[PDB]
C-alpha cells in the first residue's frame, strides 16, 4: 500500500518515533507496512505491532462505550426523542473499530501465524487473534456474536495449549494470554467461574516458579500476576 516504497528498517524506525510522539495511528500504519514486507517479525517488532494497534483500538473502544451508554439512556422510558444522530454516530465509530480489528486479523492470517514456528511467536499471534475477535465480540449482537465468540475462544485455546506445553508458568506471554482469556470468560462468555478458576490456577503456578527467576524476570512476571490478583479481587 502507501508504505510500499519505504524501507522495512525505516518503517520500524518511524514506528518507534511515532510511539515517542504518541502518534499511534501513524505507528500502526508503519507497522502494517513493515508486516507487509513479508519477513517474519522479531520479538521487539511484534511488541511494536501490538502496542500500536492496542492504542488505536483502545481509543475506539472507549469512544464506543461512551456513545453506547448515551444510546441506551435514550431508549429508556421518559427519555425524549432526539432523532437518529446518536445511533448514526455510534454506528460510525463501531464500523471504524470493526475495520481496525479486521485489519489486524488480516495481517495475522496473511501471513504472520502460518510462518510462526517458535512458541514465543506463535502464542503471541494466536493471543492477538483472540484479543481482536474479543473486541469484535464486544460490539456484536445476535447470531454473528456467537460465531465471533467461538473464533475468539478457539484462538485463545490453541494459544493456551501451546503455552502450557512449551513455556514456563512465569513466562510473560503465557501469563498475559491467561489473563486475557480469563477476561474473555468473565466479560464475553458469561463464564465467571471459569474466569476465576483460570486466574487462580495461573497465579498459583506462577508463584511456585518465581524462585527460578532473575531479579529482572521476577519483576516482569509479578507485574502481570498483580493484574490476575486485581481481577480476582474484583470478581470475588
Amino acid at each position: 500500500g502507501a508504505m510500499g516504497s519505504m524501507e522495512r528498517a525505516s518503517l520500524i524506525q518511524k514506528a518507534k518515533l511515532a510511539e515517542q510522539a504518541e502518534r499511534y495511528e501513524d505507528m500502526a500504519a508503519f507497522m502494517k507496512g513493515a508486516v507487509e514486507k513479508g519477513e517474519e517479525l522479531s520479538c521487539e517488532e511484534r511488541n511494536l505491532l501490538s502496542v500500536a494497534y492496542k492504542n488505536v483500538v483502545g481509543g475506539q473502544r472507549a469512544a464506543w462505550r461512551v456513545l453506547s451508554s448515551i444510546e441506551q439512556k435514550s431508549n429508556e422510558e421518559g427519555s425524549e426523542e432526539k432523532g437518529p444522530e446518536v445511533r448514526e454516530y455510534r454506528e460510525k465509530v463501531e464500523t471504524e473499530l470493526q475495520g481496525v480489528c479486521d485489519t489486524v486479523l488480516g495481517l495475522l492470517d496473511s501471513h504472520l501465524i502460518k510462518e510462526a514456528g517458535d512458541a514465543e511467536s506463535r502464542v503471541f499471534y494466536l493471543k492477538m487473534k483472540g484479543d481482536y475477535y474479543r473486541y469484535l465480540a464486544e460490539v456484536a449482537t445476535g447470531d454473528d456474536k456467537k460465531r465471533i465468540i467461538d473464533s475468539a475462544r478457539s484462538a485463545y485455546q490453541e494459544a493456551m495449549d501451546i503455552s502450557k506445553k512449551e513455556m514456563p508458568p512465569t513466562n510473560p506471554i503465557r501469563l498475559g494470554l491467561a489473563l486475557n482469556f480469563s477476561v474473555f470468560h468473565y466479560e464475553i462468555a458469561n463464564s465467571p467461574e471459569e474466569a476465576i478458576s483460570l486466574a487462580k490456577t495461573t497465579f498459583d503456578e506462577a508463584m511456585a516458579d518465581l524462585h527460578t527467576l532473575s531479579e529482572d524476570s521476577y519483576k516482569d512476571s509479578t507485574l502481570i500476576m498483580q493484574l490476575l490478583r486485581d481481577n480476582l479481587t474484583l470478581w470475588t
Binding site: 502496542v51 486475557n180 480469563s182 502481570i224 470478581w235
Partner: peptide, 9 residues
C-alpha cells in the same frame, strides 16, 4: 468496574 486485560510494552 471493568476487568483489566494486559497492557503491551
Amino acid at each position: 468496574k471493568r476487568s483489566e486485560s494486559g497492557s503491551p510494552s
